[PDB]
Amino acid sequence: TWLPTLVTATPQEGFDLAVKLSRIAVKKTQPDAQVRDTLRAVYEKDANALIAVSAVVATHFQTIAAANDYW
Amino acid sequence: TWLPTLVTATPQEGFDLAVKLSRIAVKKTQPDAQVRDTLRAVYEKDANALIAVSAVVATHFQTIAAANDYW
Amino acid sequence: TWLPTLVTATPQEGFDLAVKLSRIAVKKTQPDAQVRDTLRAVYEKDANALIAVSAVVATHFQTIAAANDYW
Amino acid sequence: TWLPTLVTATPQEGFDLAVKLSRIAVKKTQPDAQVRDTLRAVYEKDANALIAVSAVVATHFQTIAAANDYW
Amino acid sequence: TWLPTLVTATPQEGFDLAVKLSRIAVKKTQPDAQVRDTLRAVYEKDANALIAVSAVVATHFQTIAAANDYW
Amino acid sequence: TWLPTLVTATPQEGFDLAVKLSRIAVKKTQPDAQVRDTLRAVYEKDANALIAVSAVVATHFQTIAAANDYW
Ligand code: HEM
Ligand code: HEM
Ligand code: HEM
Ligand code: HEM
Ligand code: HEM
Ligand code: HEM
């Protein structure tokens, strides 16, 4: 039971839930934590990757903001 | 009959379905399970590929979440 | 008369309609079926392309799910 | 006056308008019809370009479809 | 006071507002007009860039169409 | 407490918040402000990077605009 609800007390908590939702898709499709570390070293310093990341969390934040009727 | 409903009990199973839906699209377009195996070996270790992947499911989760009235 | 309605009997039929809607954009912008075959040989085996494909059908499935009030 | 309304009789004409809308954006940004011809020759034979293209129209179709109350 | 409202008299005016909204994000993140000119010379003739542009304005047009209850 | 509310007085401040939200995502993922400086130097002069950037904020603006009932 990792995703109980989308209901979030503050908009802030929603954005962290949004970052969370983004990473869990990743952890599911690549559960090998050893390779998840090796790729981190790569994208953490890649501009386009980091923009692309914000893109994902943007989509999710849209879903959870609506879940909270925009707090 | 693989996609009976968008209704899901919890957000967790909303996210799992979102993931499945993401996958069935590639399965329909590229049915040769063998080549699917070849490319798995390429994207599972790609950073940009994994973030892209997270995005697709983020769009899908957005649909089902709405379909469940956000739990 | 290729696109009569977005109304779909089952969620499943909506996803196939979504895959359809994705390909018709392609067929319109590149009606030369000869080059559509040559490009198929290329993207059918490209991981990023295949993710990108799921992305498109994801957007469309969002539109048709809503059209069916999520079945 | 090129974009009078988003109202469209059928979904088919919804998709055609979606396509047009996609195109008018590139036409506005790059008005030199000649170079537009040069690049046409490059993307019409690009796979990733065609899928990208399908995506833009998928976003647009999403807007008008909503504007037509989904027919 | 550059962005007073999203309310637009005609759908057409909404698309121009959408193109506007797209460029202002750019002007904010890169206010040096000298480098904005140098990059223009580059993307104005890049197919994928020009598709990518239409993608942005597509998202925005979705937001402003809704703002106008689709005119 | 950095994200107190999505409510914004004007669309202008809607767009500014949208931009901020876009940035906080990269700040959370990559907190080492120093490397953030290094990559700034790379994307601020990239065309595809700037359009990508505009897209993220276009998604975000879509969320808050909805949260403000479009002003
Ligand atoms: C917009 C995203 C796209 C989606 C969702 C999509 C989906 C599909 C699907 C589901 C099939 C059937 C595969 C099978 O059952 O064997 C297919 C086949 C095919 N697609 Fe795509 N496609 C997309 C883009 C493209 C593009 C850009 C091209 C090239 C211009 C293309 C060319 C083809 C061709 C030629 C086939 C028939 C392949 C064969 O002979 O087996 N498609 N596509
Ligand atoms: C829409 C984006 C995609 C998502 C969300 C996704 C998700 C997943 C997940 C959750 C798994 C299970 C991983 C595990 O339990 O270790 C998986 C495995 C797999 N995927 Fe993807 N995938 C995507 C795209 C693709 C593509 C483009 C391909 C290649 C054609 C592909 C081929 C495979 C294969 C063959 C496996 C089984 C791998 C193994 O043997 O461990 N997937 N995927
Ligand atoms: C966000 C997506 C963008 C859109 C929708 C967009 C749209 C437009 C449009 C419609 C024009 C007017 C073209 C004309 O009438 O001649 C234009 C011009 C221009 N754009 Fe973009 N643009 C985008 C991104 C960018 C970026 C990333 C840059 C570089 C930082 C840029 C720099 C310029 C410049 C310098 C001009 C004036 C070009 C000239 O001197 O004719 N734009 N853009
Ligand atoms: C937003 C994504 C786009 C869509 C949906 C789109 C769609 C289309 C369609 C449906 C056609 C008619 C094809 C035919 O009847 O054979 C076409 C042709 C054309 N497009 Fe695109 N296009 C897009 C982007 C672009 C871009 C970026 C350029 C280059 C600046 C471009 C330049 C052209 C030109 C010059 C033609 C006429 C080609 C010919 O002479 O056959 N389009 N496009
Ligand atoms: C889906 C988009 C993603 C988002 C929003 C995201 C976000 C984050 C955030 C906020 C952190 C914490 C950073 C810190 O506080 O130091 C983090 C760390 C990390 N991420 Fe990502 N991430 C994404 C994709 C990925 C991918 C694709 C991978 C590789 C498979 C990955 C691997 C890691 C690892 C290993 C860490 C821990 C790094 C460390 O040891 O400091 N993430 N991520
Ligand atoms: C989500 C997309 C992004 C948006 C909307 C965005 C927006 C902005 C804006 C509006 C500024 C102020 C520019 C000025 O006043 O001259 C800025 C500056 C800056 N950005 Fe971004 N940014 C994005 C992504 C990133 C990324 C990926 C990085 C690198 C990790 C980054 C690092 C920086 C840094 C270090 C500055 C300060 C630059 C300076 O000293 O002038 N941003 N950004």
Automatic annotation (TrEMBL), chains A, B, C, D, E, F:
Keywords: Heme, Iron, Metal-binding, Plasmid
Residues noted as binding heme b in the record, renumbered to the chain: 43
Domain of life from the UniProt record: Bacteria
GO molecular function, one term: metal ion binding
InterPro entries cross-referenced by the UniProt entry: Hexamer_Tyr-coord_heme_pr_HTHP, HTHP_sf
The name this protein goes by in its record: Peroxidase
Natural source organism: Ruegeria pomeroyi (strain ATCC 700808 / DSM 15171 / DSS-3) (Silicibacter pomeroyi)
